[PDB]
Design a protein around this ligand. Structure first.
Ligand SMILES: COC1=C(OC)C(=O)C(C/C=C(\C)CC/C=C(\C)CC/C=C(\C)CC/C=C(\C)CC/C=C(/C)CC/C=C(/C)CC/C=C(\C)CC/C=C(\C)CC/C=C(\C)CCC=C(C)C)=C(C)C1=O
Ligand SMILES: CCCCCCCCCCCCCCCCCC(=O)OC[C@H](COP(=O)([O-])OCC[N+](C)(C)C)OC(=O)CCCCCCCCCCCCCCCCC
Ligand SMILES: CCCCCCCCCCCCCCCCCC(=O)OC[C@H](COP(=O)([O-])OCC[N+](C)(C)C)OC(=O)CCCCCCCCCCCCCCCCC
Ligand SMILES: NC(=O)C1=CN([C@@H]2O[C@H](COP(=O)(O)OP(=O)(O)OC[C@H]3O[C@@H](n4cnc5c(N)ncnc54)[C@H](OP(=O)(O)O)[C@@H]3O)[C@@H](O)[C@H]2O)C=CC1
Ligand SMILES: CCCCCCCCCCC[C@H](O)CC(=O)SCCNC(=O)CCNC(=O)[C@H](O)C(C)(C)COP(=O)(O)O
Ligand code: SF4
Ligand code: SF4
Ligand code: SF4
Ligand SMILES: [Zn+2]
Lengths: 155, 176, 342, 209, 115, 96, 145
């Protein structure tokens, strides 16, 4: 039946997307250091299929790791625009989540969500590299639960 | 006491210069560089098998905030507002009101995880060990609003991680 | 008003406005824009959706955290509509489709679904329901889109007597399928106007104008029961309109008269596609109807919003279509297309 | 020791710093207004704002001073003073391993000669004082905002400036742009009035006026 | 006491001269911003905004103040020239997303408790 | 004990329940109202009142450093039982 | 000599994991084939192994349960599937497993360790936990006038 065929196509495409999540080298602050430590041998992003890649044209997930300030927010929004779809935003740290320590400052965006649609909120100051890996795996399951071709079949 | 890190003049004996020319032509330190990486590939990798294998922690680890309670069942919090008055990020909001029994307990105890800095200052300030930073750190959420913790959510965390948090405090209270 | 619906603040994101609303079909064109305005003033939006949640991602960052709430709903399920409209002051109906899918014809998305929305909204107890139709809505128009829209308007009026009915003429914007349609027609050789397109008069209205009109109608205490008609300020001849569209895009213009039945065949051929049907018979028809002037119906100016002429807001739409050659030319380089006087 | 908690006090350094303070006061009586050594052995020279270029140069070039490193250059804003802005120069002498402080005053609309000619490190520092406080430094190679965002309106570090500013940022889909809006916080900064109404230190007791 | 140091100009006329040449630079610039920054507002729609910005602080009379805003406007021109400001930074001058605010007392009373 | 409001919303220990004519309940549909079933108001009630045989008694909450600051309760009024202000445990003189 | 023993213990790898079928089960599920002493098991089904010979970090590990709380976890697993009592032992925060040293029991402690409830309709929605502050006048019902 057509539903089974589109189901299997959904599983294949979602598996590819979740098993080759290519992130972006967009570290901003101390939350980037853990972003490096999970790339360090101990946790090693590489075994999970995730390999760092600059040039947003060839990346899927943006881990906004660090404080997002007013002077940088236009750059972050523009760079998010460069990403071809599908795209995902993982927010690392309290600063990139809702403001963190400098939530009441004059030149800090009170949450990265106000600029891009954040897909996964990873809490911490900074989050432990295990916690960030957990957030990435949660995003992976999110991609696994996508129903693109199913919705197309029931257009 | 100081040392000259790069103050070495190379010897100009015929043997020395022959060795330098051999290293230049027949790449020698380059071969050493290859050999080092060969030696480490043959070595054991350091990666752990997350999530089936977890990196080591300590009983002092700071994670998800949680409200504890006495063994009787009554909450430890008495709304003294030390944690709210000491939080560097002003992430705690407390509203108190005398309960029906008479004990002073928070009618609202909200901790904003999206604004928290996980310093642990609240758990030091608490005179009754009511608010603690639990061992949990894998509590990422898909939406922002789920990170704005209420009193009920914090009490649920306290009731859930109580087995771990009681042991962690038991193994660390003597240092404090 | 309830104790939490009393307006508070200064109109910013974190301000209680009291416009708790449901926008059916928010995931597309004006459905996005309206939400933005609803998000801007600080109103709790109960945006329902049937598509993949990823497609609702651009819906997320226009409201303060906790304001926008997404729910799953199905057109042929009264329980879903009841769930989404149970706690809401206003229910805005923006459900539509330029084509007829296999599981949804024109009547389903313009009569049946609006009927269910209006009936369930009346049962729940909402105070305002803004239904959206087309200006050229007629029970005898050849295109099934406009005919279905007319019967849907009558049904919605019957079910919700005080429902505000807004009849926009033609929305042009960054994603409009009206200016981008003409611009994208460059791929298929020349632009094949029917009878050279010298008999059709179109009155396009800016998207921001329509969304602001919806917001004002919600805020206006007299929009209940009324039937507004949202049209642009000028009336363009279709050939002159395409001339302006291709001049602002600086693409070569190759007009080509085309017999009506041959264009119907072309529309069928494009309808065959099991994906986004670039052109349908309804589509090729509608671009040939003139915009029926309805002076009796109240307009945008009554709501207090001045229509923005297409010339000022045409560079936004067609700057993407320009090649690298005329990618930086200013807005005043191309002279406004001559307009037949209203 | 008899004082296991009280920080040890060095008096030889106090005598040396006092001697050098008198030395500098005698050398440049034109600008040196008042010199004082703190209890923790730090010497501060308060000069007239016209003595910014001369005095620094002396401290940079004299054989007995040899202060050849501008460690820090900052300003402190005290609204209750006439010339609220108070520019502070911190200098370090590597030959006599000694730190000196030269502090001058300036109001909102009075310029200060740029010390870029003397201390080329000041070039960026000056801009910061301009950006954070608004003190304009004349004869500067290039004065510009260094920390605030482009198009910022105001001087953040001024006391008469809210810590949350006046304008926040957002992304608007209608204009497809990162727009700026008037500030509106979800939770207002709870201003805590923590100050004991009992005098703390009898030593620093201001005489009544 | 009543007499204090000058910034750049030594009278109001020289300050007006500096204001005049700053307006010269801005007026000459504006179309270059419209083209280079890919703005969609009309050229005149930016020149009149330059005029309005100049007319905003047209009430000041202390010379030193006038030199101060001359330097500040020079800095903003400097940012605009070498693409240091961006499209969003320039567009902030035209407050677009801001809803229009009312001026009559009656609407303010209807909308909220503010002066 | 947690009970149900007429709308259907469970009331918390703080007596919080959104009104029927309140739009905020929209947040809870397709979700649940996170409440704590273990009510401290009830849980402290059935704890037995200790028959202390002295005029005053010291309570630390149990565990020394694990408990609350030690406070001394005066058990002199025969009409009431001395209750610690930190943990809520009651004490009573042996029938005086 | 060590080559032969090395080839041999690769067969103890398949023998320990209940034969070939269990060998591919653990290989495709937990991505490892290493064996270890069964330190314990929890009520949810996760099996908890330890091998002190492994270097610090992989001396203890979990094979997660196939099913927990009405959710198939045969293929998708996460770090929140660890019950609180065993999370201490797994993360090397103690050397006492719950089997030997069991955590103290109390009434308020849960009996079913819910995993991360994000995404599922059992999410957490923030809300005000306080009552109203200002009351209304509730005008009388008699027309009177
Ligand atoms: C001082 O402060 C600092 C900060 O302070 C705040 C900072 O923030 C930052 C900034 C922060 C960062 C940079 C973050 C940290 C980043 C890192 C540490 C980087 C870590 C990187 C890694 C772990 C990964 C490195 C990558 C490696 C080792 C290898 C990559 C190589 C690859 C090959 C990757 C794979 C990619 C590709 C494209 C291959 C896949 C493609 C294929 C297989 C295609 C196959 C196709 C087919 C088979 C087709 C077959 C067709 C057939 C048969 C027929 C077809 C014909 C038809 C007709 C259809 C820095 C630097 C900083 O310093
Ligand atoms: C070798 C590869 C074999 C498998 C190839 C799969 C390719 C999938 C491409 C993406 C899905 C597109 C599709 O079929 O329908 C799009 C459908 C179209 O249905 P739709 O009406 O939801 O449109 C999606 C929303 N817009 C129009 C805004 C993009 O959408 C999706 O699948 C995503 C939702
Ligand atoms: C152009 C079109 C070309 C079309 C060619 C035809 C085949 C294309 C697709 C091939 C893969 C289809 C998907 C099925 C397999 C898959 O990805 O499973 C993922 C899923 C992912 O499951 P998962 O999501 O639970 O895995 C991650 C989570 N943990 C790690 C916790 C388990 O895995 C399996 O189904 C297990 C398969 C095990 C065996 C795999 C093959 C081994 C032999 C390979 C030999 C070399 C081949 C070259
Ligand atoms: N020029 C114009 O386009 C004019 C349009 N209108 C009316 O405005 C409304 C919105 O127009 P516009 O935003 O451009 O349209 P779009 O096609 O861009 O968006 C239509 C919306 O309706 C939803 N929808 C369609 N069919 C169904 C269905 N069967 N069940 C559930 N949801 C459904 C879509 O969901 P999804 O995104 O998942 O498909 C989407 O959210 C329509 O009623 C249209 O006729 C009025 C005047 C002029
Ligand atoms: C928007 C996109 C581009 C980017 C943004 C473009 C605008 C940037 C503006 C930057 C400059 C700044 O706003 C204004 C300044 O510095 S000084 C203004 C003139 N103010 C005075 O000089 C005080 C006294 N005023 C007068 O004397 C009279 O106003 C006048 C000068 C007309 C003489 O009149 P008389 O002769 O009649
Ligand atoms: S959340 Fe904490 S660690 Fe992350 S950037 Fe902000 S302050 Fe640094
Ligand atoms: S640990 Fe968290 S809640 Fe406690 S004071 Fe620090 S930031 Fe606030
Ligand atoms: S410090 Fe402890 S007892 Fe005091 S209010 Fe905070 S949680 Fe309650
Ligand atoms: Zn007690």
């Amino acid at each position: 039946r057509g539903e089974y065929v589109v189901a299997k196509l959904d599983d294949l495409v979602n598996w590819a997307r979740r098993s080759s999540l290519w992130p972006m080298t967009f570290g901003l602050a101390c939350c980037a250091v853990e972003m490096m430590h999970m790339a360090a041998p101990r946790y090693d992003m590489d075994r999970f299929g995730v390999v760092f890649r600059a040039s947003p044209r060839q990346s899927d997930v943006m881990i906004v790791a660090g404080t997002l300030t007013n002077k940088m927010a236009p750059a972050l929004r523009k760079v998010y625009d460069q990403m071809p779809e599908p795209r995902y935003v993982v927010s690392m740290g309290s600063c990139a989540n809702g403001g963190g320590y400098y939530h009441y400052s004059y030149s800090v965006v009170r949450g990265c969500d106000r600029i891009v649609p954040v897909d996964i909120y990873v809490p911490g100051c900074p989050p432990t590299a295990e916690a960030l890996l957990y957030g990435i795996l949660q995003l992976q399951r999110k991609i696994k639960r996508e129903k693109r071709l199913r919705i197309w079949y029931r257009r | 006491t100081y040392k000259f890190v790069n103050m070495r003049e190379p010897s100009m004996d015929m043997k020395s210069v022959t060795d330098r020319a051999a290293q230049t032509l027949l790449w020698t330190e380059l071969v050493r560089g290859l050999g080092m990486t060969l030696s480490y590939l043959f070595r054991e990798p350091a990666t752990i098998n997350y999530p089936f294998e977890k990196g080591p922690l300590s009983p002092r680890f700071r994670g998800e905030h949680a409200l504890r309670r006495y063994p009787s069942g009554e909450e430890r919090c008495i709304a003294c507002k030390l944690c709210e008055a000491v939080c560097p990020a002003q992430a705690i909001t407390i509203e108190a009101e005398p309960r029906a029994d008479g004990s002073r307990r928070t009618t609202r105890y909200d901790i904003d995880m999206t604004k928290c800095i996980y310093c642990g200052f609240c758990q030091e300030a608490c005179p009754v060990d009511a608010i603690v930073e639990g061992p949990n750190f894998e509590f990422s959420t898909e939406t922002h609003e789920e990170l704005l913790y209420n009193k009920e959510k914090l009490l649920n965390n306290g009731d859930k991680w109580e087995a771990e948090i009681a042991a962690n405090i038991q193994a660390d209270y003597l240092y404090r | 008003l309830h104790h939490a619906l009393i307006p508070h603040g200064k109109g910013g994101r974190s301000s209680v406005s009291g416009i708790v609303a449901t926008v059916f079909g928010a995931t597309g064109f004006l459905g996005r824009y309206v939400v933005n305005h609803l998000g801007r003033m600080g109103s709790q939006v109960i945006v329902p959706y049937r598509c993949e949640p990823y497609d609702t991602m651009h819906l997320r960052p226009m409201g303060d955290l906790g304001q926008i709430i997404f729910m799953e709903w199905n057109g042929k399920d009264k329980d879903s509509i009841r769930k989404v409209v149970e706690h809401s002051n206003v229910v805005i109906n923006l459900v539509g489709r330029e084509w007829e899918t296999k599981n949804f014809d024109f009547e389903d998305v313009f009569v049946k679904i609006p009927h269910a929305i209006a009936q369930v909204s009346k049962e729940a107890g909402v105070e305002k329901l803004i239904h959206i139709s087309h200006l050229n809505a007629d029970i005898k128009s050849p295109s099934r889109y406009l005919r279905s829209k007319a019967v849907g308007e009558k049904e919605v009026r019957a079910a919700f007597p005080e429902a505000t009915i807004i009849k926009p003429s033609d929305i042009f914007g960054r994603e409009d399928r009206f200016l981008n349609y003409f611009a994208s027609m460059r791929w298929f050789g020349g632009v094949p106007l029917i009878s050279l397109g010298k008999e059709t008069v179109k009155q396009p209205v800016y998207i921001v104008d329509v969304s602001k009109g919806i917001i004002n109608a919600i805020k206006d205490p007299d929009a209940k029961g009324k039937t507004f008609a949202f049209v642009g300020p000028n009336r363009y001849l279709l050939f002159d309109l395409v001339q302006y569209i291709f001049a602002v895009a600086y693409r070569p213009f190759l007009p080509y008269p085309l017999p009506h039945f041959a264009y119907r065949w072309v529309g069928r051929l494009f309808e065959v596609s099991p994906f986004e049907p670039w052109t349908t018979r309804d589509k090729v028809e509608r671009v040939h109807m003139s915009d029926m002037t309805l002076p009796h119906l109240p307009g945008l100016e009554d709501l207090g919003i001045q229509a923005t002429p297409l010339e000022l807001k045409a560079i936004e739409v067609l700057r993407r279509h320009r090649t690298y050659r005329w990618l930086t030319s200013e807005m005043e380089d191309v002279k406004p297309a001559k307009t037949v006087n209203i | 020791d008899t004082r296991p908690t009280i920080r040890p006090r060095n008096d030889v350094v106090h005598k040396q710093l006092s001697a050098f303070g008198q030395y500098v006061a005698e050398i440049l009586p034109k600008y040196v207004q008042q010199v004082q050594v703190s209890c923790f052995n730090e010497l501060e020279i308060f000069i007239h704002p016209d003595g910014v270029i001369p005095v620094l140069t002396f401290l940079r070039d004299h054989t007995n001073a040899q202060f050849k490193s501008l460690a820090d250059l900052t300003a402190v804003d005290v609204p209750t003073r006439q010339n609220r802005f108070e520019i502070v120069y911190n200098l370090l002498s590597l030959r006599f391993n000694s730190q000196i402080r030269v502090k001058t005053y300036t109001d909102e609309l009075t310029p200060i000669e740029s010390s870029v000619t003397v201390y080329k490190a000041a070039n960026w520092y000056e801009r910061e004082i301009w950006d954070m406080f608004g003190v304009f430094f004349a004869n500067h190679p290039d004065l510009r905002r260094i920390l605030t965002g482009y198009g910022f309106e105001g001087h953040p570090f001024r006391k008469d400036f809210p810590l949350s500013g006046y304008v926040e940022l957002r992304y608007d889909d209608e204009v497809k742009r990162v727009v700026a809006e008037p500030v509106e916080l979800a939770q207002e900064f709870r201003k805590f009035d923590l100050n004991s109404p009992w005098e703390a230190f009898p030593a620093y007791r201001q005489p009544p006026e | 006491g009543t007499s204090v140091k000058p910034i750049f100009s030594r009278d109001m006329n020289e300050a007006k001269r500096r204001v005049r040449e700053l307006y010269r630079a801005w007026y000459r610039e504006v179309p270059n911003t419209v083209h280079l920054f890919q703005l969609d507002i009309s050229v005149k729609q930016g020149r009149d905004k330059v005029r309005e910005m100049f007319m905003k602080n047209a009430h000041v009379t202390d010379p030193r103040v006038v030199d101060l805003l001359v330097i500040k406007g020079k800095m903003e021109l400097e940012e605009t020239i070498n693409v240091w400001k961006q499209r969003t930074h320039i567009m902030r001058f035209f407050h677009e997303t801001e809803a229009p605010r009312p001026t009559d007392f009656l609407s303010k009373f209807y909308v909220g408790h503010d002066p | 004990g947690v009970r149900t409001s007429p709308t259907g919303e469970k009331v918390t220990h703080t007596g919080q329940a959104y009104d029927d004519g309140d739009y905020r309940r929209v947040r809870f549909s397709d979700r649940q109202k996170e409440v704590n079933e273990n009510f401290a108001i009830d849980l402290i009630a059935e704890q037995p009142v200790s028959e202390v045989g002295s005029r005053v008694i010291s309570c630390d909450g149990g565990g020394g450093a694990l408990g609350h600051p030690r406070v001394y309760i005066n058990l002199d009024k025969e009409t009431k039982t001395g209750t610690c202000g930190y943990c809520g445990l009651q004490f009573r003189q042996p029938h005086h | 000599m060590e080559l032969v023993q090395v080839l041999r213990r690769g067969l103890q790898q398949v023998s320990g994991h209940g034969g070939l079928r269990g060998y591919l089960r653990v290989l495709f599920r937990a991505n490892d084939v290493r064996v270890g002493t069964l330190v314990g098991e929890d009520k949810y089904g996760n099996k908890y192994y330890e091998d002190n010979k492994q270097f610090f970090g992989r001396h203890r590990w979990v094979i997660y349960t196939t099913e927990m709380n009405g959710r198939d976890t045969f293929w998708d697993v996460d770090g929140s599937m660890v019950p609180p009592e065993w999370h201490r032992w797994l993360h090397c925060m103690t050397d006492d497993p719950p089997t030997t040293k069991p955590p103290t029991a109390r009434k308020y402690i849960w009996t079913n360790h819910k995993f991360n409830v994000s995404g599922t309709p059992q999410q957490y929605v923030p809300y005000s936990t306080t009552r109203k502050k200002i009351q209304e006048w509730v005008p009388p019902s008699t027309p009177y006038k």
